[PDB]
Design a protein around this ligand. Structure first.
Ligand SMILES: N#Cc1ccc(O[C@H]2CC[C@H](NC(=O)CCSc3nc4ccccc4c(=O)[nH]3)CC2)cc1
Ligand SMILES: [Zn+2]
Length: 210
């Protein structure tokens, strides 16, 4: 199955991952309703996800995408947050659990900003918050998000991605780009679970502002 390898805080890989997370905290126009109010994270664990079967499916797909994108697979390290982390790290991402509805197409979404992904940790718009206190801004309960390897290949740019079922012909991913009456930040979407590898499992808590 999967093997989770703990990284030590003195390891530069650990430091690297935490910096990208802490440094990509942004202002969200919702007053912190979805992800909570914080200026910082308390990263309490970072585990490397080792799964040979998964890495091989990922690499094989990366090869097909390459063939179709003039030999560039176009890999990008992005964040993902959702209530299904434990399923993802063991079974990998699966498009079959992605459905067209609301503001989402039938794909798997990613963000370059950790605070964006944080908003989805407990569900769309934060859902009802943590399981124990039903608090979207809970500072007690431990949250988890993934910093993943995402194969974007040839991306199709657009303003909305809510009614997509697959990437457009000739493409392998879709990026919802910013717009005045639309998105505030870009969102990266894949429609095949094997186009993303859950490299890092980050366990953390948002911290209250001091
Ligand atoms: N049971 C079960 C089971 C259930 C689901 C599963 O894989 C799912 C496959 C589809 C995913 N669903 C999504 O990707 C969309 C909603 S979660 C989300 N939305 C964003 C929007 C913009 C920017 C960043 C993010 C982000 O970080 N997370 C969730 C996980 C695998 C196993
Ligand atoms: Zn809680």
């Amino acid at each position: 199955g999967t093997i989770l390898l703990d990284l030590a805080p003195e390891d530069k890989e650990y430091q690297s991952v935490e910096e990208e997370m802490q440094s990509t905290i942004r202002e969200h126009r919702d007053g912190g309703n979805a992800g909570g109010i914080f200026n910082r994270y308390n990263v309490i664990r970072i585990q490397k996800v080792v799964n040979k079967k998964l890495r091989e499916r990922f690499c094989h797909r990366q090869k097909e995408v390459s063939e179709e994108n003039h030999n560039h697979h176009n890999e990008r390290m992005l964040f993902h947050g959702s209530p299904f982390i434990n399923a993802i790290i063991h079974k990998g991402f699966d498009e079959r659990h992605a459905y067209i509805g609301g503001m989402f197409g039938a794909g798997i979404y990613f963000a370059e900003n950790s605070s964006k992904s944080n908003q989805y940790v407990y569900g769309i718009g934060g859902g009802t918050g943590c399981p124990t206190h039903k608090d979207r801004s809970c500072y007690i309960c431990h949250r988890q998000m993934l910093f993943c390897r995402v194969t974007l290949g040839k991306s199709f740019l657009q303003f909305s991605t809510m009614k997509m079922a697959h990437a457009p012909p000739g493409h392998h991913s879709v990026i919802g780009r910013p717009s005045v009456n639309g998105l505030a930040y870009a969102e990266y979407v894949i429609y095949r679970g094997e186009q993303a590898y859950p490299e890092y499992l980050i366990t953390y808590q948002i911290m209250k502002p001091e």
